[PDB]
Design a protein that fits this description.
It is classed as hydrolase/hydrolase inhibitor. The structure holds 2 chains of a larger assembly. By secondary structure, chain A is mainly β. Chain A has no helices and 8 strands. In chain B, about 15% of the residues lie in helices and about 30% in strands. Chain B contains 2 helices and 5 strands. The N and C termini of chain B lie far apart (about 30 Å). Classes of the chains: A mainly beta, B alpha+beta. Bound molecules: calcium ion.
Chain lengths: ~120, ~100
């Protein structure tokens, strides 16, 4: 995130970090067993890290759960990134609490001009 | 772990959905119906490498997934996001059967 601000700790409780030794992508928790992410983030093995704020320091609210299934959209196009969506099944259900929580799927598309919140551990310059 | 370039702390950004015409104008020939642009045509504020897969949440609803762009925070090159309101049935049916 370039030009953003630091989120208040655990104020984005549906945000997860996808880890294969180190952070490489984000995702969103949509029920206790499933994370939605991007298909170009595919790896054969992924550890899902929930409840994170500082991804380098153990703070006490983390849950580290390895993926049991990883399902990319069947019509993903790796050249154009069309259909860039992926579902990750956790090998055990996350424990939902005040710092690990789901985000709702949309009931309709958002109108142009709608203000949204974007978050992640991506590059800041 | 954040390695060599990523921040340690989760970052946040407020950004608006952009019109489809502005999105196609920024990325001629590259926008499908499964993509939406979110951000600022003046640049300066955007998602970037390491953010892909993460959320764009509007009025409490997941509307975008960080996907791609030309550079980061470049002028007339806003972030391009997977349009989640195209995929609720794929998501629900995949979860229901797996
Ligand atoms: Ca941590």
């Amino acid at each position: 995130i370039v030009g953003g601000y630091t989120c208040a700790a655990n104020s984005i409780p549906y945000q997860v970090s996808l880890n294969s030794g180190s952070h490489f992508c984000g995702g969103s928790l949509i029920n206790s067993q499933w994370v939605v992410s991007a298909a170009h983030c595919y790896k054969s093995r992924i550890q899902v890290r929930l409840g994170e704020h500082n991804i380098d320091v153990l703070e006490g609210n983390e849950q580290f759960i390895n993926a049991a299934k990883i399902i990319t959209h069947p019509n993903f196009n790796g050249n154009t990134l069309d259909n860039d969506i992926m579902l990750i099944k956790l090998s055990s259900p996350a424990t939902l609490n005040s710092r690990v929580a789901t985000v709702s799927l949309p009931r309709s598309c958002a109108a142009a001009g709608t203000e949204c919140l974007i978050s992640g551990w991506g590059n800041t310059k | 772990s954040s390695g060599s370039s990523y921040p340690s702390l989760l970052q946040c950004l407020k950004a608006p959905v952009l019109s489809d015409s502005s999105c196609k104008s920024s990325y001629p020939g590259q926008i499908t119906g499964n993509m939406i642009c979110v951000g600022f045509l003046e640049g300066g504020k955007d998602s970037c490498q390491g953010d892909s897969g993460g959320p764009v949440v509007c009025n409490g609803q997941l509307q975008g997934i960080v996907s791609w762009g030309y550079g980061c925070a470049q002028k007339n090159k806003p972030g391009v996001y997977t349009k989640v309101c195209n995929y609720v049935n794929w998501i629900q049916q995949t979860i229901a059967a797996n």
